[PDB]
Amino acid sequence: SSPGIWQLDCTHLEGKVILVAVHVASGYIEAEVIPAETGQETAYFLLKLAGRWPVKTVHTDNGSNFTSTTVKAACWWAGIKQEDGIPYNPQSQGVIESMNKELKKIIGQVRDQAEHLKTAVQMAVFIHNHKRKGGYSAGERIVDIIATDIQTK
Amino acid sequence: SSPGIWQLDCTHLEGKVILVAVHVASGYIEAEVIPAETGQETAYFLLKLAGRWPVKTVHTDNGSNFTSTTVKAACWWAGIKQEDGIPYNPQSQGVIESMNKELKKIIGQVRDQAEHLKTAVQMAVFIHNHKRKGGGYSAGERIVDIIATDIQT
Numbered sequence: 001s002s003p004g005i006w007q008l009d010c011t012h013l014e015g016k017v018i019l020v021a022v023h024v025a026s027g028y029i030e031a032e033v034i035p036a037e038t039g040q041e042t043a044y045f046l047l048k049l050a051g052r053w054p055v056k057t058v059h060t061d062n063g064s065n066f067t068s069t070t071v072k073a074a075c076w077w078a079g080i081k082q083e084d085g086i087p088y089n090p091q092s093q094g095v096i097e098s099m100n101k102e103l104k105k106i107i108g109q110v111r112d113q114a115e116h117l118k119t120a121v122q123m124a125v126f127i128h129n130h131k132r133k134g135g136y137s138a139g140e141r142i143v144d145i146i147a148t149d150i151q152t153k
Numbered sequence: 154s155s156p157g158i159w160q161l162d163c164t165h166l167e168g169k170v171i172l173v174a175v176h177v178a179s180g181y182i183e184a185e186v187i188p189a190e191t192g193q194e195t196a197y198f199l200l201k202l203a204g205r206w207p208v209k210t211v212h213t214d215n216g217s218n219f220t221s222t223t224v225k226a227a228c229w230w231a232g233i234k235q236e237d238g239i240p241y242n243p244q245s246q247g248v249i250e251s252m253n254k255e256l257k258k259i260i261g262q263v264r265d266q267a268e269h270l271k272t273a274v275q276m277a278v279f280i281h282n283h284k285r286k287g288g289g290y291s292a293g294e295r296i297v298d299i300i301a302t303d304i305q306t
């Protein structure tokens with residue numbers, strides 16, 4: 001549950017691919033719609049995430065991205081430790097599935113508003129990260145976790 | 154200089170358009186390459202930014218985006234107060250021009266590495282936000298401390 005640990009998650013809707021990075025300790029997410037999940041796309045997505053948050057470790061979402069030389073290259077470039085995403089703790093499988101279900105539910109709730117899926121996915125990221133659960137939001141928690149970490153060191 | 158204030162900045166390279174949002178108090182940025190600066194692109198970029206950080210106010214980069222119905226609609230959706238970016242303090246213009254020069258210099262430093270401009274721009278966002286200035290903190294550190302301190306008050 002370190003401040004630096006993120007998990008990649010790839011989910012499908014409307015025949016399109018949604019790539020999600022979840023900051024494990026907070027539940028905070030970033031997401032994008034991509035044409036298909038290739039090493040190049042996943043690498044570019046990781047480069048963007050790591051320029052925005054202090055990404056120390058990524059649990060990749062599958063073996064092909066764990067194997068990908070293009071993904072390993074972006075992890076090397078951005079200072080990220082690439083790990084597998086094996087759920088040694090099986091409650092992981094479950095948290096990620098519930099998150100994909102919540103995100104898809106929010107996407108359906110904004111369909112009268114967003115003409116393209118990529119808009120609906122960013123509206124879903126916005127509502128996911130601002131939702132109060134404290135009740136703190138994921139957005140609040142990730143900032144508190146990383147700030148507290150910067151202040152301990 | 155509040156924790157919620159961002160400034161839009163649009164700069165040009167390779168005849169392509171780079172759209173930047175700067176968190177004014179920290180210097181932290183996010184950026185994208187877009188085909189042209191249209192209200193729809195700026196709107197979509199603001200929606201993404203605001204799902205990621207608690208954006209309270211955005212100083213728009215020009216009058217067309219200030220005017221744009223599409224931009225105003227994304228600001229309404231995301232809870233953002235849209236303001237002009239008139240530099241009432243003239244040292245603003247200078248600070249933005251210098252960041253555009255520094256960003257372009259980093260893009261040049263990575264051209265042996267990135268085949269597409271959009272990759273070079275994300276590597277630049279990365280190196281910009283991680284740079285220690287000039288006991289010195291990075292922009293990435295400052296934005297987290299600023300917003301965390303604001304949340305705790």
Ligand SMILES: O=C(O)c1c[nH]c2ccccc12
Nearest residue numbers: 129130139140204205206207
């Ligand atoms: O409300 C807050 O303090 C937030 C800090 N970072 C965020 C990211 C997404 C949404 C809300 C916040």
Ligand SMILES: O=C(O)c1c[nH]c2ccccc12
Nearest residue numbers: 051052053054282283293294
């Ligand atoms: O180094 C840190 O603690 C950072 C916190 N937020 C960031 C965003 C980009 C780069 C570094 C950091």
Ligand SMILES: [Cl-]
Nearest residue numbers: 017036037038
């Ligand atoms: Cl795929």
Ligand SMILES: [Cl-]
Nearest residue numbers: 170189190191
């Ligand atoms: Cl343009």
